[PDB]
Amino acid sequence: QKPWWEDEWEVPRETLKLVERLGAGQFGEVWMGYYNGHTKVAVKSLKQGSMSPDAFLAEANLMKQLQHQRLVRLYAVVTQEPIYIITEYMENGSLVDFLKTPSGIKLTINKLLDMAAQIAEGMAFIEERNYIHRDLRAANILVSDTLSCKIADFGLARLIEDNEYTAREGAKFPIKWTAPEAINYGTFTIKSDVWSFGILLTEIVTHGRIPYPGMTNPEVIQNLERGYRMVRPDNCPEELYQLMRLCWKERPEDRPTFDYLRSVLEDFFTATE
Numbered sequence: 001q002k003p004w005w006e007d008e009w010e011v012p013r014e015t016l017k018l019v020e021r022l023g024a025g026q027f028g029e030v031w032m033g034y035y036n037g038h039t040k041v042a043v044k045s046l047k048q049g050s051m052s053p054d055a056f057l058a059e060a061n062l063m064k065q066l067q068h069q070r071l072v073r074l075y076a077v078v079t080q081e082p083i084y085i086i087t088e089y090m091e092n093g094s095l096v097d098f099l100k101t102p103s104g105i106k107l108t109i110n111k112l113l114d115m116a117a118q119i120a121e122g123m124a125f126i127e128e129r130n131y132i133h134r135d136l137r138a139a140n141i142l143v144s145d146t147l148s149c150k151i152a153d154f155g156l157a158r159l160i161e162d163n164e165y166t167a168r169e170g171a172k173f174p175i176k177w178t179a180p181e182a183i184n185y186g187t188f189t190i191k192s193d194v195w196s197f198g199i200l201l202t203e204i205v206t207h208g209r210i211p212y213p214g215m216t217n218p219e220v221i222q223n224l225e226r227g228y229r230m231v232r233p234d235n236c237p238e239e240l241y242q243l244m245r246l247c248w249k250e251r252p253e254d255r256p257t258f259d260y261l262r263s264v265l266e267d268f269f270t271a272t273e
């Protein structure tokens with residue numbers, strides 16, 4: 001990269017004021033704050049010694065490569081300890097939480113379909129740029145004050161050289177959200193994200209409910225291997241459920257592109273008003 005003294009993303013720590021802590025965890029904190037007095041930003045800070053700082057900053061570096069309306073935008077970095085990654089502030093927080101607030105509860109199927117399409121749109125850009133996300137799920141979609149959605153959390157996002165990223169055989173991923181090939185072989189492609197997109201669609205129509213209701217991970221694995229897919233969620237339009245099924249096709253290459261998912265969901269949207 002460019003060194004910190006020539007990096008257009010580096011800002012002096014003084015330009016930032018941390019105002020409200022939104023979360024804390026093993027590897028640091030997330031705050032709402034302001035850049036230069038007036039500009040609302042989210043600030044993620046690294047707990048010294050909790051993890052490699054090269055590992056922490058690799059998220060920012062990848063976000064320098066993936067700039068788009070539909071993706072949470074890198075705002076800046078402070079590369080001295082404690083290391084900050086500063087990003088586009090999203091006023092309604094994560095999709096999984098928002099769908100449960102009183103504003104979320106009152107959204108029509110029309111608006112949920114609209115949101116689903118905005119997410120596919122952001123994933124179509126990622127697809128086109130030869131990236132994969134690997135952590136696609138309602139928890140990693142953020143919602144703006146105008147009820148628009150953006151992809152977030154690029155900690156696991158990877159650029160593909162040859163269609164395929166292969167994780168280490170020590171690597172664990174969430175069972176309900178991760179395509180079978182990635183769980184079984186550690187192999188991820190944009191088609192693994194497509195599968196995750198299908199699961200994410202269930203979280204949208206159930207207002208944030210956990211996938212595969214009443215099932216353990218071993219039950220989900222066993223069911224999938226029989227050829228079953230997730231039971232029809234309550235109140236899921238059958239069109240949307242069949243779209244989910246496409247994302248969950250056995251062979252990765254039979255699963256649709258994100259551009260197709262996008263166009264299909266816009267049609268579903270324009271036809272529900």
Ligand SMILES: COc1ccc(Nc2nn3c(NCC4CC4)cc(C)nc3c2C(N)=O)cc1
Nearest residue numbers: 022030042044088089090091092093094139140
């Ligand atoms: C009710 O408390 C809250 C909680 C969260 C928010 N919004 C936000 N939550 N959040 C994060 N938390 C984790 C979430 C799962 C991804 C991480 C980052 C990098 N930005 C944000 C915002 C953001 N960009 O604004 C707002 C109010």
